Symmetry: C3
Subunit: 108 residues, 3 copies
């Protein structure tokens, strides 16, 4: 792990968000920077029958860590996006289960 997914933001803004990001995340999560992936997810928000700006919605798929690491990642992500948008920044952490996760055919 970890796998970060962003929806609700422009693709190029997601690319820019990732500059230096795996270094910082690796330090906070105490794991190598190379264990991080980042995606822009292609979606469209709607509300009451119209196109909506939605929000910036970020999923973090990882082997869970304590709340201190989680809280710091949330703060970091929120601070970074708030520089570019006044949209709400929403972050959900999704704990992976080791025996349900495979990398190249074996557990991680």
């Amino acid at each position: 792990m970890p796998h970060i997914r962003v929806r609700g933001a422009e693709k190029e803004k997601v690319r820019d968000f990732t500059a230096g990001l795996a270094d910082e995340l690796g330090i906070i999560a105490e794991c190598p920077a190379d264990w991080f992936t980042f995606e822009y997810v292609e979606t469209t928000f709607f509300f009451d029958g119209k196109e909506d700006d939605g929000l910036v919605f970020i999923e973090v798929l990882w082997f869970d860590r304590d709340s201190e690491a989680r809280d710091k990642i949330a703060a970091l992500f929120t601070e970074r996006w708030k520089k570019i948008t006044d949209k709400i920044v929403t972050i959900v952490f999704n704990p992976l289960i080791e025996n349900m996760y495979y990398e190249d055919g074996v557990h991680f």
Copy 2:
């Protein structure tokens, strides 16, 4: 919360599905209409090496409520889509965990 995602349907049909929808959902879930987001998710279904019509697949990400609210949302979604398609309508509810969910850097 709640975050509704739709795949397998035309983007404009997802937009139309959302007309009035957050009012009705807010009433069933007992929360404000403004707490709902809706997305079309860009995906392509395949089956046995060919393009497939797939089904209409709906994810609801929320703080879980009882089965009565869940059952009513499922019925509502199914009835609405069945007006437009004879495709199977599949709905999955995904319970969020409060300490793993952040809005603007704090828990909800």
Copy 3:
């Protein structure tokens, strides 16, 4: 269930991956081939401020089965993708909860 989603690969490669696949999966999981859906998910990987090749990332949404079925599906998927790419092949299994899953408005 089961619902297989692939990201990080070309759309046509996902289509080809699915040739014969539901037969084989049905045999391993002991359920009908028709219970399987397959999607290409439209996403873009980034790393350190640049476009990245990412990896091939596969999600399997299903009613959980034992590790033997899981391990065999993982091996099968990995072997098939390794024929086409030297990218890392990552597979996550996501257990569905029966009372949170609806097909045409009723539980499965």
